[PDB]
Structures are given as structure tokens and as C-alpha cells.
Amino acid sequence: SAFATCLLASVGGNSSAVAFPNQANYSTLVAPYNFDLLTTPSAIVWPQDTQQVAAAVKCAVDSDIKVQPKSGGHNYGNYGSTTGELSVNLDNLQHFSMNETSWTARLGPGNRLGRVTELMYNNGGRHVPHGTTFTVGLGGHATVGGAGAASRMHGLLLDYVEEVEVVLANSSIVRASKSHNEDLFFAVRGAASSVGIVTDFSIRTEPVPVSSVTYSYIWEGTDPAARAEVFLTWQSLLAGGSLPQHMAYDLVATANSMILGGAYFGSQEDFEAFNLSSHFKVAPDVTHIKTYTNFFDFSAAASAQTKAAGIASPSHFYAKSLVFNQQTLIPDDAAEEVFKYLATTKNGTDLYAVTFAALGGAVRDVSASETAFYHRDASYFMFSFGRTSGDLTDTTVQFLDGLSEVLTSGQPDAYYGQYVGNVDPRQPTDEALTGYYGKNLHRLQQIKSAVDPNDVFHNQQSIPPL
Ligand SMILES: *Cc1cc2c(cc1C)nc1c(=O)[nH]c(=O)nc-1n2C[C@H](O)[C@H](O)[C@H](O)COP(=O)(O)OP(=O)(O)OC[C@H]1O[C@@H](n2cnc3c(N)ncnc32)[C@H](O)[C@@H]1O
Ligand SMILES: *[C@@H]1O[C@H](CO)[C@@H](O[C@@H]2O[C@H](CO)[C@@H](O[C@H]3O[C@H](CO[C@H]4O[C@H](CO)[C@@H](O)[C@H](O)[C@@H]4O)[C@@H](O)[C@H](O)[C@@H]3O)[C@H](O)[C@H]2NC(C)=O)[C@H](O)[C@H]1NC(C)=O
Ligand SMILES: *[C@@H]1O[C@H](CO)[C@@H](O[C@@H]2O[C@H](CO)[C@@H](O)[C@H](O)[C@H]2NC(C)=O)[C@H](O)[C@H]1NC(C)=O
Ligand SMILES: *[C@@H]1O[C@H](CO)[C@@H](O[C@@H]2O[C@H](CO)[C@@H](O)[C@H](O)[C@H]2NC(C)=O)[C@H](O)[C@H]1NC(C)=O
Ligand SMILES: *[C@@H]1O[C@H](CO)[C@@H](O)[C@H](O)[C@H]1NC(C)=O
Ligand SMILES: *[C@@H]1O[C@H](CO)[C@@H](O)[C@H](O)[C@H]1NC(C)=O
């Protein structure tokens, strides 16, 4: 086809840097993360640099094909491999350099977070707040938000993004920053996937913490009332404002445990002195506290823990998200109903996790309207994850759907955000857009119309032009 010819030329005739349906191994090359929502892109291309990205986009445009990039491939709907669209695989764009005058790093989108973490540490003992899973790609992560262990302390990853290079739908290459193409910069910091392909990032850094203390307190058992009590305490201690601003603080419910976990940036002695578990009516069954003098080790261990938990690998699953704030905190009775629901509902899973992850702190230092990330006044995220041994069934979809309903049952008609970093393809696109972007939606549609009127950069739940 013209498309195939064009697209081979976009990578300089390197036939290893393009793949088409009907090539051997195509479904493996697509590399699904979610194993249920398998896709067949019209082609996959592996550009070497920005120019080849721009060339490949043009090939799609010339053949009336739409485009998504793929960096780490962690999208929960495999949207970076959308069916019938060009998948621009950015695995080759993994450059890294450190400006030691400012400790600002310049990095390609194909860097996965484990490499980002290693290279920032090695280049002068630096880091930036980001997520905990090492296989997440920077390209899709810095462009949605990027919340992790250091976020209460320092904010989102995208709060450290100072400049980007972006390939636009017409194959123009631009830069964006707070001082230049400010509108594009707004959209890239939380909604890049709808407006262009980020081919380079300049990211400010912080010195690593001197001391990083991981904690984990576990309550074992299946009693819904006991579990609700742990949740309610967890929620009220967060809402009360007594927690140290810098400390990561999360609660994970599984079928047989509640795990209060996080990170404290200070001495183990000072952490232990704070006596976090004393606020709970029932003492945890297990406490694990570990100090890391090396921040790379801390980060590697955090990544290894989520992988070991079974919730961080390509798999069959469904997953949903919600944002809660001081105005939508879950009432006592609804929390009781949440844990009753988890206790008795037929779930179809081989594993589930319901994660409550505190935000606040430095995340709130930036206003909702300053970047495309809307949820700045959030108290916490709720992420639900239901893994299955074989193909997903409606049992598990209904399970998570009904869970979101009971979680919001204290105030069913209030606004609830969703994190666009954890896409939920099994809902109306209208509800998704409203959840993902909130009142930033209108401005994003304006920018979409400005930079991509023909909707080249499209997925199931992308921002539509006006
Ligand atoms: C899989 C996963 C995700 C995850 C997580 C744990 C796991 C196991 N833990 C997270 C956490 O602790 N904190 C957080 O903030 N997010 C966490 N996530 C979610 C992760 O941030 C998102 O899934 C993120 O978007 C993944 O990025 P990645 O780069 O790996 O994924 P992708 O499928 O290739 O892309 C996602 C979407 O963004 C678009 N994209 C990709 N690259 C670009 C560039 N360069 N420019 C513009 N858009 C880009 C894709 O097209 C897709 O729509
Ligand atoms: C609500 O969700 C619960 C959580 O998923 C459901 O329980 C789960 O039920 C499945 C199916 O019965 C069960 O499957 C696994 O059980 C064996 C033991 O677990 C192994 O898991 C690790 C890997 O994760 C494995 O490497 C270890 O050897 C470990 O022993 C497995 O051998 C088997 O192949 C299968 O994977 C889950 O264990 C079970 N989870 C728990 C912790 O209970 C529950 O059924 C559901 N309830 C309702 C009402 O629907
Ligand atoms: C031809 O294209 C392929 C794909 O881009 C290139 O192979 C990759 O090379 C990198 C090293 O630069 C390896 O780490 C990857 O595993 C390869 N990616 C694949 C196979 O998808 C190859 O270098 C290119 N040849 C050139 C540029 O002459
Ligand atoms: C390709 O599209 C971009 C984005 O619409 C165009 O850039 C804009 O051009 C208008 C009018 O000149 C400016 O007001 C905007 O500030 C530009 N936006 C950017 C750069 O983000 C660009 O001109 C188009 N290129 C071609 C050759 O048509
Ligand atoms: C496809 O993958 C298999 C297994 O990984 C490999 O042995 C084979 O050489 C691949 N085929 C092609 C045409 O690359
Ligand atoms: C923490 O609080 C509990 C009471 O809930 C108390 O028994 C324990 O001694 C305290 N631990 C400290 C401060 O080391």
C-alpha cells in the first residue's frame, strides 16, 4: 500500500523498524498490557528520532489513518496500540543527559521509570517524584500526572517538566514551556495523548532524601466491620491534617488483608516515634519497617513489591479509579457497605486490590487550572484492580462497577474524578472525559481544535475537537 511504502521510508528503509498485520509475530509485537482488550494496529513503527516520528505521522495522515504513540505500553485499554491506527512505538527514544548546572535532565519518552530512576541517581544523586513501577514509560507517565512515594513531598512528575518537544498532527515540530506555546504546554501536562507526540522532556530534579523509610502495617482477616474500621480511621487521620506533609500514605484492601503502607523521608527513629499504628482501634497483626540509605535501592524495592503483589504485570484484568476530596469523603455507613460488598459479591477474580493513595501535600501547590491534571484538591485516589486467571468475564466487570457505585453511595450525584493514568474503557466516553479532565475539559477541547482539528491523535476516550 502507499501507507506501507511511506511508512518504510519514514524509518529509512529499515524493515525491522516497521511491522504490519499479517507479519509473523504481529500480535506479540503489539505487546498488549491488558490481555482482554487485544488490538490490531494498522501498523507499528519504531522511529529513531523526532524527524522519523514526524515522518511517520505524515504517512498516517496521508492515508487517513489516526495515530497513537506508545512509550511503556502500560495503558489499561492498550490505547497506544489502538486498532486500525498507527502505533508509534518510542522504544528507541531513550536518550538521557544531565545539565549539572541546574540538575535538569533531558530525557526521551522511551525511558522506563527504572532507567529514569537509575540515571537520575547516578548523575549527581537526583530524583523526581514519579510512580513506583519500573516498567512504566516516561512518555505516557509524565503526560498524565505521575504520582508516587515522593508526591506529597514534591508534587507530580509533571510539576517538574520544564519543557517538551512535541510532534504535531501536521508533522510540525514545536517546543512548549510555561513561557512558550503555553496552551500546548498545559495540554501536554495531563492530556498529551490527545494533542501530539512528546519526543523529548526537560525535567527538573531534587536531591534524593538522606533517609527513606518504608512501612507496612497488616491486618489479616475477612471481617467487613473490622476492615471498614481500618479504612475509616485511615480516612479520618488523613483528613485531620496531622500527618507529616512529606510522608506517603496508602491503604490496600485485598480479600484477606488490609495493608497500611507508605514512605517516610526521615529517620526510622522519628518515624517509629510518630507511632502511626497507635491511631487504630485494633493493632495490626504485622509491622514491617525498613530504612534505605540508598534511594535507588528504596525505589527498586518499591517496584519489586508491587510486581510481587501480582497487580503490576501484563495480565487479564479490569480496573477502575475514583478521586475523593474533603467534600466527598466516604461516610461511615457507606464504608461499612463497601466492605460488606467486597466480602460477599461474586467477583470472578484470582486476585483483587482496592488501593487508597493519599494525595495532598505538594500536589495541591499547583492549581487545577494550571495544568491539564484537574484533581489538585484530591484527598486520595481509589484504584480498584481485579485480575482473572483466564479471559475476563462480566462477573468481574460487574464486580468493579458495583464497587464504584457503593464507594460513591454516600453522595451519589457529587463530582468524582478519575485518573486518566488508569484508563477505564468500560464506561461512556462522556463519563470518562468528565472524570478524567473535569472543568479543564472545555479548554482542552479548544486546544485540541487549535492543534489537531482533524483528530489525528485519537483513542477511545481522547479529547474531541469542539
Ligand atoms: C501499568 C501500571 C500503571 C501505573 C502504575 C502501575 C502499573 C502496573 N502505577 C502508577 C503509579 O504509581 N502512579 C501513577 O501516576 N501512574 C501509575 N500507573 C499509570 C501510568 O502512569 C499510566 O498508565 C501511564 O500513562 C503509562 O505510560 P506508558 O508510557 O507506560 O503507557 P503507554 O500505554 O505507552 O501510553 C499511555 C497513553 O499516553 C500516550 N503516550 C505515550 N507516550 C506518549 C508520548 N510520548 N507523547 C504523548 N502521549 C504519549 C499513549 O498513546 C496512551 O494514550
Ligand atoms: C473474591 O476475590 C478473591 C480474591 O481474588 C477470590 O479468591 C481467590 O480465588 C481464586 C480462585 O478460587 C484463588 O486462586 C488461586 O488459588 C491458588 C493459591 O494461591 C496462589 O497464588 C499465588 C499467585 O498469586 C501462587 O503463586 C501461590 O502458590 C498461591 O498459593 C492457586 O494455586 C490457584 O492456581 C489460583 O491462582 C485465589 O487464591 C483466591 N485468593 C484469595 C487470597 O483468597 C474469591 O474467590 C472471591 N470471592 C467471591 C465471593 O467471589
Ligand atoms: C533497525 O530498526 C530496529 C528497530 O528500531 C533497530 O533495532 C533496535 O535496536 C536497538 C538498539 O539501538 C535494540 O535495543 C532494540 O532491541 C531494537 N529494536 C527492535 C528490534 O524493535 C535497529 O537498530 C535499526 N537499524 C539501524 C538503525 O540501522
Ligand atoms: C501545524 O499546526 C500548528 C498547530 O496548529 C501550527 O502552529 C500554530 O500556528 C498558529 C498560526 O500561525 C499560531 O498562532 C500558533 O501559535 C501555532 N501553534 C503552535 C505552534 O503550537 C503550524 O503553523 C502548522 N504548520 C503548518 C506548516 O501548517
Ligand atoms: C517470532 O518469535 C519466535 C519466538 O520468539 C522466534 O523464534 C521467531 O524467530 C520469530 N519470527 C520472526 C519471523 O521474527
Ligand atoms: C504506640 O502506641 C501504643 C498505644 O496505641 C502504645 O502501646 C505503644 O507503646 C506506643 N509505642 C511507642 C510510642 O513506641
Numbering used by the authors: 5 to 470
Text of the article:
Sorbicillinoids are yellow secondary metabolites synthesized through an elegant combination of enzymatic and spontaneous biochemical processes. SorA and SorB work in tandem to synthesize the hexaketide precursor sorbicillin, while SorC and SorD are involved in the subsequent oxidative processes, including dimerization and oxidation reactions.11,12 Specifically, the monooxygenase SorC catalyzes the oxidative dearomatization of sorbicillin to form (S)-sorbicillinol.
The C-terminally His6-tagged SorD from Penicillium chrysogenum ATCC 48,271 was produced in Aspergillus niger following a CRISPR/Cas9-based expression method. SorD belongs to the vanillyl-alcohol oxidase/p-cresol methylhydroxylase (VAO/PCMH) family and more specifically to the berberine bridge enzyme (BBE) subfamily. As with other oxidases from the VAO/PCMH family, the general structure of SorD contains two domains (1.55 Å): the N-terminal FAD domain (residues 45–212) and the C-terminal substrate-binding domain (residues 213–435). SorD also comprises a short C-terminal BBE domain (residues 436–468). The structure contains the partial remains of the N-terminal signal peptide (residues 5–22), and five N-glycosylation sites were identified (Asn18, Asn29, Asn174, Asn279, and Asn351). Several members of the BBE subfamily are characterized by (bi)covalent incorporation of the flavin cofactor. This feature was also found in SorD, where the FAD is covalently attached to residue His78. Moreover, upon testing the thermostability of SorD, we found that the enzyme is more stable under acidic conditions, with the highest melting temperature of 66 °C observed at pH 4.5.
